[PDB]
RNA sequence: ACACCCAGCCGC
């Protein structure tokens, strides 16, 4: 097994960031774990909109695609849920969906903001995440919203809404030594936030034997999930895939002479 | 189907057999209501 | 011997001769030349153009009415 | 009639369409979208292979 | 039947100023709503993607398909008999990189 | 290359240049004439010989379709039965390959003081490759 | 109207296969993986596992067509070590390095929580 | 027409940020301090929420 | 469900 031994770091550890520092790795790995962090990670968001009675000023697309991307919290759940497509329910089973109904009216001489604290979900372990809140549409005397929503978990390749994460900042090789990116005038290009050259320096001298093994991350969660389960779950859906290839060619090995 | 008004936002009972006219206030405009049949939305 | 035309066949000449076998072998005609493995008529056609096995004779019109009939197989080829 | 009926004239099988670029496609290539390719047809005689 | 891939086509566009504003492609069979070119396919049709609609012809005779393709294809019709030089040619992003 | 753009299919997804195409139908019942009058009403097979191979269920009771309802392409939203001087269909369809949702449905009186109708159908455009 | 289902770049209907194996024939053992509906987060990864292998002499991989969803990993080794049994090494490594990367940094998040 | 729920490029939520945001500017605040009192680090989201239309108010003036 | 007339707009 030609494999080298990767290392991690946690700077620092808040509710929304996660930033970690991995060592000893090629950079495809690291790439790949930040396209899985984009993509590969499945989280709970609304993907079926079944509109009873709309009398707002926004019409029924645009209220069902703020419905969508807004977030669902999905610590534990998503892993335990099944996708829609793979389960044997006839179109959507509480097995693999959560409910939602939104019923709100307006009487009042005052507008009304229909947040996302007007969302009564079924299972309440999935939630809008801001239970500052999540408004859908303005209403005004006489108008009403009915609405029954299914949510589903899903993949943010397949759309936008099951991203989990909200801008995954990927540097490596902060000093500018192993030339990657060359400087036409390196002294005016700030120095960045990893950096340990000095002020009157510009950048880290060249390296010809030199590889990059220094990843510095700065995910960070819309909500969704916590900035913990992303990382933990992305490497695992990687590993999941790899094994998926790795029985897939045993069974081409198999069948093949 | 039935209608609703366009100033008083009333509902109306006409099946093509009668004038175009509000019952209350008159008005010649009348919009129809949202079918009761339910549309799947993706939310994608 | 009466033969005042150009000993090669033109590119015009390549596409309808191309053609209109194709068209023939479409229409079932019996293929000169062996198959082995090819479904579309054009590639057979390039096939025959290639073996000069092509069942094609081409009657060339010089600009006073009188006529020169030659033979593909007899033509050189443009390959 | 004669320029506008006869030098031209308009033809069954054409499709227009908005072209975008494909750098992954060889020079002898067009991408076509699909309900154009469904829709436009090419006649094949039945050959007996 | 339908047409799939490897069809061939005649692919113009207007205004029709010469020759080599008329070539045959092959169909290739892509997943949105756009015909898709070579990028080298653009200067002899003097074309650009800033909204340029551009058309398709399709034969269904074999002769006709045959003429298209060995009369009208875009390799055999890379050099013009305008100026015995390559109308076709390395553009934009690929001329400005190669060197 | 070329005078084109690469879009973000995730900002996309996520509502960048998002837009809907509001198209309206106006038609009205012109009963001018001795007995050529096109009343509103659901076309059956029975009478109104002339007809098409369109979806002809969605309609409602007064010869319209209703807002809210899906429409495809070549659909009927309007049912005008003119007496042949039994009767014929004169009934609009939807544009060629269109595609939406009807938003309203107007009925009044236009200046001639006739039957007038409009259907105004809602598709949304997300954008694609092709759009300038 | 053309639009592709939002689902198709990483689903697999009824008769494609994920995973092919083509022998090439123009250099003695090579072969072609033609891996369907994936892109490059696992090109990128077992091209670079195959490239730190010592006995690989050719590891590459392309995407044909970003609309489609095909992924071509061409593998050359010596004549001693068949490249599929590389491409296996390459995988099982891959898992190595994730389920290890995976507990170091559970381990981290235990340690920053409890102090 | 109203605050989108979601920015465009990275994905951060700037729909709940709407409202406090105008009230930053009820309380006489600069509106780059009041992106920075929101977290907005980002220009991305500093564009969403700094020129962003309430034309929703707008059309709220007109009867059902 | 057309046919003329007019206007506007797209690419070169
Ligand atoms: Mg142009
Ligand atoms: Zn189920
Ligand atoms: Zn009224
Ligand atoms: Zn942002």
């Given at each position: 097994?030609?494999?080298?031994?990767?290392?991690?770091?946690?700077?620092?550890?808040?509710?929304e960031?996660v930033?970690?520092?991995?060592?000893?790795?090629?950079?495809?790995?690291?790439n790949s774990i930040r396209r899985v962090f984009i993509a590969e990670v499945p989280i709970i968001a609304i993907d079926w909109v079944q509109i009873?009675?709309?009398?707002?000023?926004?019409?029924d697309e645009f209220i069902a695609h703020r419905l969508g991307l807004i977030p669902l919290t999905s610590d534990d759940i998503v892993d335990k849920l099944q996708y829609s497509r793979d389960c044997t329910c006839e179109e959507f089973c509480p097995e693999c969906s959560v409910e939602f109904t939104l019923?709100?009216?307006?009487?009042?001489?005052?507008?009304?903001?229909?947040?996302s604290?007007?969302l009564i979900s079924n299972s309440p372990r999935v939630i809008p995440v801001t239970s500052?809140?999540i408004?859908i549409?303005?209403?005004?005397?006489?108008?009403?919203?009915?609405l029954r929503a299914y949510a589903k978990k899903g993949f943010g390749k397949e759309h936008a809404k099951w991203n989990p994460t909200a801008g995954v900042?990927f540097?490596?090789?902060?000093?500018?030594?192993?030339?990657?990116?060359?400087?036409?005038?390196?002294?005016?290009?700030?120095?960045?936030?990893?950096?340990?050259?000095?002020?009157?320096?510009?950048?880290?001298?060249?390296?010809?034997?030199?590889?990059?093994?220094?990843?510095?991350?700065?995910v960070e969660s819309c909500g969704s999930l916590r900035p913990e389960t992303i990382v933990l779950s992305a490497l695992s859906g990687l590993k999941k895939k790899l094994s998926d290839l790795?029985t897939q060619?045993?069974?081409?090995?198999?069948?093949?002479? | 189907?039935?209608?609703?008004?366009?100033?008083?936002?009333?509902?109306?009972?006409?099946?093509?057999?009668?004038?175009?006219?509000?019952?209350?206030?008159?008005?010649?405009?009348?919009?129809?209501?949202?079918?009761?049949?339910l549309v799947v939305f993706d939310a994608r | 011997?009466?033969?005042?035309?150009?000993?090669?066949?033109?590119?015009?000449?390549?596409?309808?001769?191309?053609?209109?076998?194709?068209?023939?072998?479409?229409?079932?005609?019996?293929?000169?030349?062996?198959?082995?493995?090819?479904?579309?008529?054009?590639?057979?056609?390039?096939?025959?153009?290639?073996?000069?096995?092509?069942?094609?004779?081409?009657?060339?019109?010089?600009?006073?009415?009188?006529?020169?009939?030659?033979?593909?197989?007899?033509?050189?080829?443009?390959? | 009639?004669?320029?506008?009926?006869?030098?031209?004239?308009?033809?069954?099988?054409?499709?227009?369409?908005?072209?975008?670029?494909?750098?992954?496609?060889?020079?002898?290539?067009?991408?076509?979208?699909?309900?154009?390719?469904?829709?436009?047809?090419?006649?094949?005689?039945?050959?007996?292979? | 039947?339908?047409?799939?891939?490897?069809?061939?086509?005649?692919?113009?566009?207007?205004?029709?100023?010469?020759?080599?504003?008329?070539?045959?492609?092959?169909?290739?069979?892509?997943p949105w709503?756009?015909?898709?070119?070579?990028?080298?396919?653009?200067?002899?049709?003097?074309?650009?993607?800033?909204?340029?609609?551009?058309?398709?012809?399709?034969?269904?005779?074999?002769?006709?398909?045959?003429?298209?393709?060995?009369?009208?294809?875009?390799?055999?019709?890379?050099?013009?008999?305008?100026?015995?030089?390559?109308?076709?040619?390395?553009?934009?992003?690929?001329?400005?990189?190669?060197? | 290359?070329?005078?084109?753009?690469?879009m973000n299919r995730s900002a996309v997804d996520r509502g960048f240049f998002r837009?809907?195409?509001?198209?309206?139908?106006?038609?009205?019942?012109?009963?001018?004439?001795?007995?050529?009058?096109?009343?509103?009403?659901?076309?059956?097979?029975?009478?109104?010989?002339?007809?098409?191979?369109?979806?002809?269920?969605?309609?409602?009771?007064?010869?319209?379709?209703?807002?809210?309802?899906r429409?495809?392409?070549?659909?009927?939203?309007?049912?005008?039965?003119?007496?042949?001087?039994?009767?014929?269909?004169?009934?609009?369809?939807?544009?060629?390959?269109?595609?939406?949702?009807?938003?309203?449905?107007?009925?009044?009186?236009?200046?001639?003081?006739?039957?007038?109708?409009?259907?105004?159908?809602?598709?949304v455009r997300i954008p694609q490759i092709?759009?300038? | 109207?053309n639009a592709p289902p939002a689902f198709e770049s990483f689903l697999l209907f009824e008769?494609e296969?994920k995973?092919?194996?083509?022998?090439?024939?123009?250099?003695?053992?090579?072969?072609?993986?033609?891996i369907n509906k994936e892109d490059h987060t696992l090109g990128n990864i077992?091209?670079?596992?195959?490239?730190?292998?010592?006995?690989?002499?050719?590891?590459?991989?392309?995407v044909?067509?970003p609309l489609e969803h095909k992924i071509?990993?061409?593998?050359?080794?010596?004549?001693?070590?068949?490249?599929?049994?590389?491409?296996?090494?390459?995988?099982?490594?891959?898992?190595?390095?994730l389920?290890?990367?995976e507990?170091?940094?559970?381990?981290?998040?235990?340690?920053?929580?409890?102090? | 027409?109203?605050?989108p729920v979601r920015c465009f490029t990275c994905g951060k939520i700037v729909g709940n940020?709407?409202?406090?945001?105008?009230?930053?500017?009820?309380?006489?605040?600069?509106?780059?301090?009041?992106?920075?009192?929101?977290?907005?680090?980002?220009?991305?989201?500093?564009?969403?929420?700094?020129?962003?239309?309430?034309?929703?108010?707008?059309?709220?003036?007109?009867?059902?």
């Amino acid at each position: 097994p030609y494999a080298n031994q990767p290392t991690v770091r946690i700077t620092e550890l808040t509710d929304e960031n996660v930033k970690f520092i991995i060592e000893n790795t090629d950079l495809a790995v690291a790439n790949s774990i930040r396209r899985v962090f984009i993509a590969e990670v499945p989280i709970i968001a609304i993907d079926w909109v079944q509109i009873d009675a709309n009398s707002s000023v926004l019409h029924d697309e645009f209220i069902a695609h703020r419905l969508g991307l807004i977030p669902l919290t999905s610590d534990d759940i998503v892993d335990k849920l099944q996708y829609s497509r793979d389960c044997t329910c006839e179109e959507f089973c509480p097995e693999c969906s959560v409910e939602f109904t939104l019923d709100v009216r307006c009487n009042e001489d005052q507008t009304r903001h229909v947040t996302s604290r007007d969302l009564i979900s079924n299972s309440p372990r999935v939630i809008p995440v801001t239970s500052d809140d999540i408004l859908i549409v303005k209403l005004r005397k006489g108008q009403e919203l009915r609405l029954r929503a299914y949510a589903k978990k899903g993949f943010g390749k397949e759309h936008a809404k099951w991203n989990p994460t909200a801008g995954v900042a990927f540097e490596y090789d902060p000093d500018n030594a192993l030339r990657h990116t060359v400087y036409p005038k390196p002294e005016e290009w700030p120095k960045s936030e990893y950096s340990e050259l000095d002020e009157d320096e510009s950048q880290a001298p060249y390296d010809p034997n030199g590889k990059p093994e220094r990843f510095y991350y700065n995910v960070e969660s819309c909500g969704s999930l916590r900035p913990e389960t992303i990382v933990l779950s992305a490497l695992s859906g990687l590993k999941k895939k790899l094994s998926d290839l790795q029985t897939q060619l045993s069974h081409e090995i198999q069948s093949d002479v | 189907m039935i209608y609703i008004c366009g100033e008083c936002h009333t509902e109306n009972e006409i099946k093509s057999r009668d004038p175009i006219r509000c019952r209350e206030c008159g008005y010649r405009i009348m919009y129809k209501k949202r079918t009761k049949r339910l549309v799947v939305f993706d939310a994608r | 011997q009466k033969r005042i035309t150009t000993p090669y066949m033109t590119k015009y000449e390549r596409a309808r001769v191309l053609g209109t076998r194709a068209l023939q072998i479409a229409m079932c005609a019996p293929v000169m030349v062996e198959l082995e493995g090819e479904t579309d008529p054009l590639l057979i056609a390039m096939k025959e153009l290639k073996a000069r096995k092509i069942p094609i004779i081409i009657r060339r019109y010089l600009p006073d009415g009188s006529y020169e009939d030659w033979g593909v197989d007899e033509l050189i080829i443009s390959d | 009639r004669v320029r506008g009926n006869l030098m031209g004239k308009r033809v069954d099988f054409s499709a227009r369409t908005v072209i975008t670029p494909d750098p992954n496609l060889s020079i002898d290539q067009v991408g076509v979208p699909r309900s154009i390719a469904a829709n436009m047809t090419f006649a094949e005689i039945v050959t007996p292979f | 039947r339908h047409m799939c891939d490897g069809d061939i086509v005649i692919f113009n566009r207007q205004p029709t100023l010469h020759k080599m504003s008329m070539m045959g492609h092959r169909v290739r069979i892509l997943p949105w709503s756009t015909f898709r070119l070579n990028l080298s396919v653009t200067t002899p049709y003097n074309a650009d993607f800033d909204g340029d609609e551009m058309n398709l012809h399709l034969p269904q005779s074999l002769e006709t398909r045959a003429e298209i393709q060995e009369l009208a294809m875009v390799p055999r019709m890379i050099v013009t008999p305008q100026s015995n030089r390559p109308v076709m040619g390395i553009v934009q992003d690929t001329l400005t990189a190669v060197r | 290359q070329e005078d084109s753009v690469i879009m973000n299919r995730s900002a996309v997804d996520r509502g960048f240049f998002r837009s809907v195409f509001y198209r309206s139908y106006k038609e009205q019942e012109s009963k001018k004439g001795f007995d050529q009058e096109e009343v509103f009403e659901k076309p059956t097979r029975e009478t109104c010989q002339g007809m098409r191979h369109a979806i002809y269920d969605k309609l409602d009771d007064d010869g319209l379709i209703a807002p809210g309802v899906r429409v495809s392409g070549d659909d009927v939203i309007i049912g005008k039965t003119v007496t042949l001087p039994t009767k014929r269909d004169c009934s609009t369809f939807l544009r060629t390959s269109e595609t939406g949702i009807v938003d309203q449905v107007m009925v009044t009186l236009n200046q001639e003081g006739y039957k007038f109708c409009k259907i105004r159908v809602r598709s949304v455009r997300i954008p694609q490759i092709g759009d300038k | 109207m053309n639009a592709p289902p939002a689902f198709e770049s990483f689903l697999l209907f009824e008769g494609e296969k994920k995973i092919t194996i083509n022998k090439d024939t123009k250099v003695p053992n090579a072969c072609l993986f033609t891996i369907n509906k994936e892109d490059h987060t696992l090109g990128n990864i077992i091209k670079s596992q195959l490239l730190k292998d010592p006995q690989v002499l050719f590891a590459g991989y392309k995407v044909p067509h970003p609309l489609e969803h095909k992924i071509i990993i061409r593998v050359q080794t010596t004549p001693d070590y068949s490249p599929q049994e590389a491409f296996t090494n390459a995988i099982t490594d891959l898992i190595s390095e994730l389920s290890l990367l995976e507990e170091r940094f559970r381990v981290a998040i235990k340690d920053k929580q409890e102090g | 027409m109203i605050i989108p729920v979601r920015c465009f490029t990275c994905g951060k939520i700037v729909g709940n940020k709407w409202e406090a945001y105008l009230g930053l500017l009820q309380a006489e605040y600069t509106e780059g301090d009041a992106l920075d009192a929101l977290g907005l680090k980002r220009y991305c989201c500093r564009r969403m929420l700094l020129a962003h239309v309430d034309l929703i108010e707008k059309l709220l003036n007109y009867a059902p």
